[PDB]
Design a protein around this nucleic acid. Sequence first.
DNA 1: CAGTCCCTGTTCGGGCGCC
RNA 2: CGGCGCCCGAAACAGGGACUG
Lengths: 555, 412
Amino acid sequence: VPISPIETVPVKLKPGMDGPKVKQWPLTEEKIKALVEICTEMEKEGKISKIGPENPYNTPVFAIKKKDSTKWRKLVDFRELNKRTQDFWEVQLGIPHPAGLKKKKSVTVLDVGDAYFSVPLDEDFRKYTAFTIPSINNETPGIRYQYNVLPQGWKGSPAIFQSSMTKILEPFKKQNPDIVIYQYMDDLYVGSDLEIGQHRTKIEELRQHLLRWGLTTPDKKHQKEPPFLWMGYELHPDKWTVQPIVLPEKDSWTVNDICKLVGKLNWASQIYPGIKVRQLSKLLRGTKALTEVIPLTEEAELELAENREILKEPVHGVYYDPSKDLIAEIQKQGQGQWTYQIYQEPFKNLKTGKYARMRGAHTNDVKQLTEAVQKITTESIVIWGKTPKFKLPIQKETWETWWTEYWQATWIPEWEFVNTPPLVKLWYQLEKEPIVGAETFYVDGAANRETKLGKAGYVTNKGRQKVVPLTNTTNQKTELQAIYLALQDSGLEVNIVTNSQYALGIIQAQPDKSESELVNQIIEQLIKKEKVYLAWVPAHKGIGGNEQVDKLVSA
Amino acid sequence: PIETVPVKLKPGMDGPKVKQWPLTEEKIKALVEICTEMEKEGKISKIGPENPYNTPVFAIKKKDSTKWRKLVDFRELNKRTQDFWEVQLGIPHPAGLKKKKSVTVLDVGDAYFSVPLDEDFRKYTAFTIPSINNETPGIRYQYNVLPQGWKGSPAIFQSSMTKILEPFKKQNPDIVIYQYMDDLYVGSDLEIGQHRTKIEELRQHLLRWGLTTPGYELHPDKWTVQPIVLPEKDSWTVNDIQKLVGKLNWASQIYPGIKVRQLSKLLRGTKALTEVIPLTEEAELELAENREILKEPVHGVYYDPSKDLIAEIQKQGQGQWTYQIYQEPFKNLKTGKYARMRGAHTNDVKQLTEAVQKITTESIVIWGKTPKFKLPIQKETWETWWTEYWQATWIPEWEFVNTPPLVKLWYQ
DNA sequence: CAGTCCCTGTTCGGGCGCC
RNA sequence: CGGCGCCCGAAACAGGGACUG
Ligand SMILES: Cc1ccnc2c1NC(=O)c1cccnc1N2C1CC1
Ligand SMILES: [Ca+2]
């Protein structure tokens, strides 16, 4: 007889499959002599066993190495067993963001020893565990065994640990509604608004409750060490910050440097406001080797400069106070880059961030704001579980004009104006109705699929015509191209008739910026006009001067 | 201690493994207070990591209700139980339900918790109650009884339901009763006074047989179809004749007898958009003859039961939305328009959510099937907020579309 | 009726940053 | 090796336009 710690979790095999038999793959020759003994340790503690006839099971060893150890850590590879083992619902859905924690008076961290080996493997699954690895080099053929606990590198270990651990803590919590626990791996972080010593009452009173299930918590544990360093963060019960950032000063710039660079700025962006990555990010376009050599443009360095000075001074985030409202404020940083701050008490921030992502071939600021406001709402719901009151560089009339006109369903939740230039504006509007006494430019374009050659031009009610030859073009660009002419050659008010559904789809969404230089020019002409009514007709219906401009260019 | 109808995932496919989307603290609370209670009742019970299946859940308040309703998005399961419900047990769709002067929708879903559910199937009802900020891991349950909103639940309860209802149906032969998931559609030509009484009356029949029921009225006889219509004009500008011709050109994919020839010819030279050109009689008569072909039906448009319904919604502005239901392009089963819905003039996402529901509802009263939506919205916008405005116990299917407007011409 | 292109957007894949 | 965030690519996927007798 062995003994029985804590409730066991049923584990099956992917139906119609069975345990593995495998040959070894290389691992370093030195550290491996120690376990020949260590296995004999575990038999007596309950972590191992053996049987002769029953195991058609053998497993190899493949590893990854770690820095910062005062002792060496053993391992075994079940990878063959893994692939054959049922899937689980993973318990780590990701980790909480610091800015989402409520402020707690007292916060301690207990580190669970023998964490994976303190958990019983499923009785009936135990069998599949049998394994063998080289003695020192090797001499005689060998022997084998089975696992009585959660094996290192097994698929179910973290999941089964995590769920079991949770099950244990549950009765403590109900008897302690106002304590707060959080579990990451084998570390527990406990906290309370109780008085400092009586908090330590419950710290032991809980180490009791963990042992009662066989879970060991030493006193090398530190209440006096916080800040705790966990995943790039420094956490004190009153305030939090990111772990220290090292910015490469290297004169030699390879694309892998900029990459490591950007990720750091972006990671910095959760706390330090105003980080901009745009110009540094331009370098990455269409490059073959991650080892390639790339130069820094003047813009990217001027930005990198502005960015370097922000990191100069330190900064810290606060925690969330459920009693008080959430406030999110966005500033336009230009070049489709955006920054936002989310705070509760003015000038003390919970967190920051950027939204730089340029979405679509042609876009505008209202759209891009709308997007940022959405990135932020989601982030806010993940973290605080509510939507912020939004502070925005946009006139309530600017916005009302856009969303109500736009063809798409679009929304910003409850939000108010902050007059903080640059203010977001709409750079032009198309008329909804024909413009009296404006010249009417009928435009068409055509190109030939084979030769990639074409012409773009127009006819007007006044007799004015134009046709321009164009080389290496497409049917679409000529249709865009004719509209461009019609803008150039027209007065401040003008009507344009186009038969391009394509062209019309673009212009009507009132882009203020485009990838396409031709659209940018159209835009630029568009902003200069006073009144533009742009209309569509079906091709080849024998319409208007549409038939006429069709003949001119298809010829 | 009663039998349990076994259930199986149609061949080849596994249980739904779909992720739980983030919830508001508001709604996470309502589920916790709802689930602990449903557990105490042994309706659901806690589960472990050995069960790797998940369906998303959230919560809603039904229209005009301050009470929180739990909602599971079983869409994925229902796709994976599907051969079971469609092929095994059919539910005849009353063609009259749609003709009734009034139709009430009663929420009967609670009754389903009576019947137990097949123990081999229960691992497929797994859902996570999420935590704010990932502070706790999820509280995971699975359904022991017949889960609300699953397509098998109203099926397996079909027998038990038909029983409890036969008295009323027998005593009231002229009243029509349909059932689509957690909802029961009940309608009659009785004056609303004797109707509302007959509904309460219907409430007891299930109230005394062990059911609870958390206005509901529809008026299908009044449901109007939005026909295509050419503007009424005194005098026509060039621009008018053009928008007209283009629209007519569109319409002719739908009605083939349309001809634009004489109306087309009116535009002949290169003329200012705003000059007023008079309608020749020969065209004037063709257009009016066109206006005719546009009051008619469309040859060969009829509902075909096997095909899915498809709904397209357009934002027309100033609080209006148009929609069309069809199974194959240009053959439309119904067309319509909405205005002054909640959110009109303030929140588009709210209005469209409202819109999707009103459309889904008619879709169920008429063909007894929910449509697949083409939603005029960016994925993330809809996906971020739709859950706030949702007042229905079902969840139609949707995909996201962008059309710069040349299809806007459904409405003037 | 099918098969060429042109254009745009949305999956995915890469590779950083934090484990 | 997985999670989250991100930047890029489009070799691919999808939608819509347009031509080919
Ligand atoms: C790393 C971590 C992750 C999640 N929550 C916490 C912590 N540790 C803390 O440092 C912490 C700090 C302040 C408030 N809550 C904290 N806690 C909660 C337990 C009291
Ligand atoms: Ca043409």
